Amino acid sequence: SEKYDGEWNEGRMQGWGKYFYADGGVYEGEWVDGRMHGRGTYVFPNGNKYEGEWVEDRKDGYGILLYTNGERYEGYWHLDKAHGKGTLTFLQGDRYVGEWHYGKKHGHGVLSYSNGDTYDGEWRDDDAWGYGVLQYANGCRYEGEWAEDRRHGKGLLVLPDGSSYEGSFAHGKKDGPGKIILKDGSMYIGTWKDGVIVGQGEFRLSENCD
Amino acid sequence: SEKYDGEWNEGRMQGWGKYFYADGGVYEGEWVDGRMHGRGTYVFPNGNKYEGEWVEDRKDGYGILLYTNGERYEGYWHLDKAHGKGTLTFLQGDRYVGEWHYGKKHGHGVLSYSNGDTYDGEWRDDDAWGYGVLQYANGCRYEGEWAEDRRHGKGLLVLPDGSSYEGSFAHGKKDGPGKIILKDGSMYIGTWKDGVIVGQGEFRLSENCDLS
């Protein structure tokens, strides 16, 4: 009573009710055995707002959280964190659609950046990890391996003009053995370090004129 | 005396006269001191014909020789051989216009092949020798050194698509140190043997949307 305006059952909050927390936060929604449980709205004193499902005072099931910072999560929650399928939109216009593991981008997901870049592929612990495709705004496309949100392992870099690089990347740059095919179809097989050709390599003219 | 129907001076053939040689050849033309000398026509028993200038029984000055085999020389002669400027046309349609040294293509000369190919440059002893340009029919152009009628020394090979090779040739083929530009600007510096790249070399990307 006073701090809780709602229904009771066996001396515990149960049914619909409003609760005013000491820090200025307000819940209005379903209660089970004295906890937020079922559908309910939580307006936080920091400006955040949740509308969705609750289990034992935690966000659990379907819910929408509008963040102060302009971010908006719409999808599934487990133990008070993003879990399963969910969409995160940012104020700038960036959008993530895909899999979540206790509050982190994890599994397969598509992140459409407002800058025009799109990443379609694998995530671990909020970073690009595994195989994924980045379609850059300028026409460049990387299809290959990622580690700690950077291109790392074997990958294909197709340029707008038709040029490609097939080979190794390390810490985001061409690094190790690789091959470039040029506009005219001729190919160079050689070695990169920190994104630049080092030493010498094999050059083979295309069979389309010589 | 009956072999010659023409004029005399100091008991020697001089002025205009006809002569019938034992082998069936016939000269009609100018005579000086009992020799073919000045303007005259010689029909040879092998079918060849000369019309032009003579000095002491030799083709010397301007003259046309039509050969049985279909070749035609038109130009200058010295001591009975092509010498100075002269045009040789062949049955096939091939044409040489340029310099001659005692019967050989020698100095500067243009050979227009019926193929469409043109060679403009230097000759020694009937072969391309020194600097010359071959404008091929297909658009390719070689500008560089020749030896024994084949590309040999340093040369530039520009392809129709803008690709070029700058470097060494031996016996007609890319051979030794050289460099390719691909027109997109990208360049390979390496080594050739018998017209093919051998081993490895230096590759430098051009400023296309590939180093950016």
Numbering used by the authors:
A (entry chain CCC): 143 to 352
B (entry chain AAA): 143 to 354
What does the publication say?
High-resolution crystal structures and biophysical analyses of a truncated form of the TbMORN1 protein and its homologues from the parasites Toxoplasma gondii (TgMORN1) and Plasmodium falciparum (PfMORN1) enabled, for the first time, a structure-based definition of the MORN repeat. All three structures are antiparallel dimers joined via their C-termini, and, when possessed of the correct key residues, can adopt extended or V-shaped quaternary structures. The crystal structures confirmed that each 23-amino acid MORN repeat is composed of a β-hairpin followed by a 6-residue loop that connects to the next MORN repeat. The structural studies presented here make a case that one conserved function of MORN repeats is in homotypic interactions and possibly also in higher-order assembly.
The structures of TgMORN1(7–15) and both P21 and C2 crystal forms of TbMORN1(7–15) were subsequently determined to 2.90, 2.35 and 2.53 Å resolution, respectively, with the PfMORN1(7–15) structure used as a search model for the molecular replacement. The two subunits in the TbMORN1(7–15) C2 crystal form and the TgMORN1(7–15) dimer make a rather straight assembly, while in the P21 form they display a bend of about 30°, leading to a rod-shaped particle appearance. In contrast to the other two proteins, the P21 crystal structure of TbMORN1(7–15) displays a bend of approximately 30° among the sub-units. Superimposing the TbMORN1(7–15) P21 subunit with the structures of the TgMORN1(7–15) and PfMORN1(7–15) subunits over 202 Cα atoms yielded rmsd values of 1.0 and 1.1 Å, respectively, revealing high structural similarity between the three proteins. In the P21 and C2 TbMORN1(7–15) crystal forms, the dimer interfaces occupy surface areas of 747 Å2 and 966 Å2, respectively. Calculations of gain in solvation free energy (ΔiG) upon dimer formation for TbMORN1(7–15) C2 and P21 performed with the PDBePISA package yielded values of -20.1 kcal/mol and -11.3 kcal/mol, respectively, with corresponding p-values of interface specificity 0.01 and 0.08. ΔiG values lower than -10 to -15 kcal/mol and p-values lower than 0.5 are significant for stable protein dimers, indicating highly specific dimerisation interfaces. In the P21 crystal structure, the position of the loop differs from that in the C2 dimer and keeps the Cα atoms of Cys351 and Cys282 at a distance of 11.7 Å, preventing disulphide bond formation. Here, the side chain of Cys351 is engaged in a polar interaction with Asp303. (A) Conservation map of the TbMORN1(7–15) P21 crystal structure reveals a highly conserved stretch of residues along the groove. Analysis of the interaction and electrostatic maps of TbMORN1(7–15) and its mutagenised variants clearly showed that Arg293 and Lys316, residing in repeats 13 and 14 respectively, are crucial for maintaining TbMORN1 in a stable dimeric state through electrostatic interactions.
